[PDB]
Curated annotation (Swiss-Prot):
It is found in: Host cytoplasmic vesicle membrane. It comes from Chikungunya virus (strain S27-African prototype) (CHIKV). ADP-D-ribose binds at residues 13, 27, 35, 115-117. Residues 4-163 form the Macro domain. Phosphorylated by host on serines and threonines. It is a peripheral membrane protein. Interacts with mRNA-capping enzyme nsP1. Interacts (via C-terminus) with host G3BP1; this interaction inhibits the formation of host stress granules on viral mRNAs and the nsp3-G3BP1 complexes bind viral RNAs and probably orchestrate the assembly of viral replication complexes. Interacts (via C-terminus) with host G3BP2; this interaction inhibits the formation of host stress granules on viral mRNAs and the nsp3-G3BP2 complexes bind viral RNAs and probably orchestrate the assembly of viral replication complexes. Interacts (via C-terminus) with host NAP1L1. Seems to be essential for minus-strand RNAs and subgenomic 26S mRNAs synthesis. Displays mono-ADP-ribosylhydrolase activity. ADP-ribosylation is a post-translational modification that controls various processes of the host cell and the virus probably needs to revert it for optimal viral replication. Binds proteins of G3BP family and sequesters them into the viral RNA replication complexes thereby inhibiting the formation of host stress granules on viral mRNAs. The chain holds residues 1334 to 1493 of 2474 of the full protein. This is Non-structural protein 3. In the N-terminus, the macro domain displays a mono-ADP-ribosylhydrolase activity. The central part called, the alphavirus unique domain (AUD) has a zinc-binding function. The C-terminus region, also called hypervariable domain (HVD), is mainly disordered and binds several host proteins. This intrinsically disordered domain contains 2 SH3 domain-binding sites and 2 FGDF motifs necessary and sufficient for the formation of nsP3/G3BP complexes. Changing residue 27 to A: Partial loss of mono-ADP-ribosylhydrolase activity; complete loss of ADP-ribose 1'' phosphate phosphatase activity.
Amino acid sequence: GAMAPSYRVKRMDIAKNDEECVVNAANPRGLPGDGVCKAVYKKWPESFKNSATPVGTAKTVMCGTYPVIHAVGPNFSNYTESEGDRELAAAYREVAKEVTRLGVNSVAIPLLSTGVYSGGKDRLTQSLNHLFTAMDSTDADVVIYCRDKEWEKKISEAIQMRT
Ligand SMILES: [Cl-]
Ligand SMILES: [Cl-]
Ligand SMILES: [Cl-]
């Protein structure tokens, strides 16, 4: 565990993280994909051997000794708001299980279903709150990665609102 487990946010490519493992915003078929998933494919391609896993689940594959946790959030273009919300919560619960099992002291995590799986809606708060629900009972240092300047401010404010 971390000595004083924390939440932080950084605005940069998750492929350049300084944590002991990474969560991929994966597709269910283990394809290279786009966005976070393509950056992860370019950085850790070995981790996509048998990474295919259903929506709402997480599957870890080692790149050397570095764990890549493939977490499959729902595509809100296909799911109802209700079913998508349930699967998005489930995917983060499976990330907390894997982080715990691996015994890491830190993890880099993107906000699942907020990019091309968002169904064209702003899901910062919905996705972040499911991340907190899952990760709050873990003792890893969590570092959230984003790319947008206003998202960085809103994520930083939500973290600070606790503490
Ligand atoms: Cl960068
Ligand atoms: Cl996405
Ligand atoms: Cl972002």
